[PDB]
Amino acid sequence: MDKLFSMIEVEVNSQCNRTCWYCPNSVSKRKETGEMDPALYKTLMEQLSSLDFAGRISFHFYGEPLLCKNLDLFVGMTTEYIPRARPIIYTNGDFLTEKRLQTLTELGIQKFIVTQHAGAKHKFRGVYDQLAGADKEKVVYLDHSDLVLSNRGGILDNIPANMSCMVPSNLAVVTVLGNVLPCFEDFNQKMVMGNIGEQHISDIWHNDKFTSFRKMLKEGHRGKSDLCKNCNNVSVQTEEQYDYVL
Ligand SMILES: C[S@@+](CC[C@H](N)C(=O)[O-])C[C@H]1O[C@@H](n2cnc3c(N)ncnc32)[C@H](O)[C@@H]1O
Ligand SMILES: N[C@H]1C[C@@H](O)[C@H](O)[C@@H](O)[C@@H]1O
Ligand code: SF4
Ligand code: SF4
């Protein structure tokens, strides 16, 4: 029986305020849009609770989590249902004030992965520079120039263990409508594994499609998948839970 995912990334809202040249938002729109139905997030929390999920949970796919109107609710529910899990927010930081950071931290966020992206310098620069140490220690502050740019499953043409990949052995994405993907690169949802409104995520994780896919990619057979065949992402090649990889 395959190990449960150690990481789950939830699309609590589909939209972003930016259109980075190295992001599919610059060239396509998400095929699902909106904010996650609170009842669906509750269903996800019930399922993760039933598994004693204690890995990383994050709140983005290709949108900006601080735009989620129910972010406070969802972070609070995370702490209530899966107190052993590690909530980590990746954010462009454009909306991240000190007050916002502190509210989120109090509700359960353990780390913020904040990236200053191409274009306008955000106000978080000055906020970060003024943060007390205890808050500052909770932030990994990246520039987009620090990222190891992936072509996002071959969507981006302007972007140039070997080929092994462990993402689908370690991680699941839940889209805003509850569809489960095996990788965060699957912007176009080429590999929907199931929907958590119809099946328990554990059963989806362990189904033949998902089990076969993760074995295939562990062996480095990217060529056998429309999702992976042109993918240049080699950042996740071990079995370990991570907070972030560049
Ligand atoms: C798709 S972004 C989504 C969350 C939020 N919108 C943000 O930018 O932080 C998830 C993470 O991937 C990083 N990222 C964006 N484009 C990337 C790319 N082409 N290759 C690798 N990482 C990328 C972002 O900086 C962010 O840390
Ligand atoms: N390098 C980043 C890329 C991001 O899209 C994934 O969601 C995150 O898990 C990774 O750590
Ligand atoms: S801020 Fe994040 S989601 Fe938005 S366009 Fe840039 S990389 Fe994509
Ligand atoms: S090869 Fe690329 S698209 Fe396929 S699972 Fe790995 S990171 Fe995702």
From Swiss-Prot:
GO terms for biological process: antibiotic biosynthetic process. It catalyses: 2-deoxy-scyllo-inosamine + S-adenosyl-L-methionine = 3-amino-2,3-dideoxy-scyllo-inosose + 5'-deoxyadenosine + L-methionine + H(+). [4Fe-4S] cluster 2 binds at residues 165, 183, 219. One of its GO terms (molecular function) is 4 iron, 4 sulfur cluster binding. Binds 2 [4Fe-4S] clusters. One cluster is coordinated with 3 cysteines and an exchangeable S-adenosyl-L-methionine. A second auxiliary cluster is also in contact with the substrate and is proposed to facilitate the loss of the second electron in the oxidation. Pathway: Antibiotic biosynthesis; butirosin biosynthesis. Its EC number is 1.1.99.38. [4Fe-4S] cluster 1 binds at residues 16, 20, 23. Catalyzes the radical S-adenosyl-L-methionine (SAM)-dependent two-electron oxidation of 2-deoxy-scyllo-inosamine (DOIA) to amino-dideoxy-scyllo-inosose (amino-DOI) in the biosynthetic pathway of butirosin. This is S-adenosyl-L-methionine-dependent 2-deoxy-scyllo-inosamine dehydrogenase. It comes from Niallia circulans (Bacillus circulans).
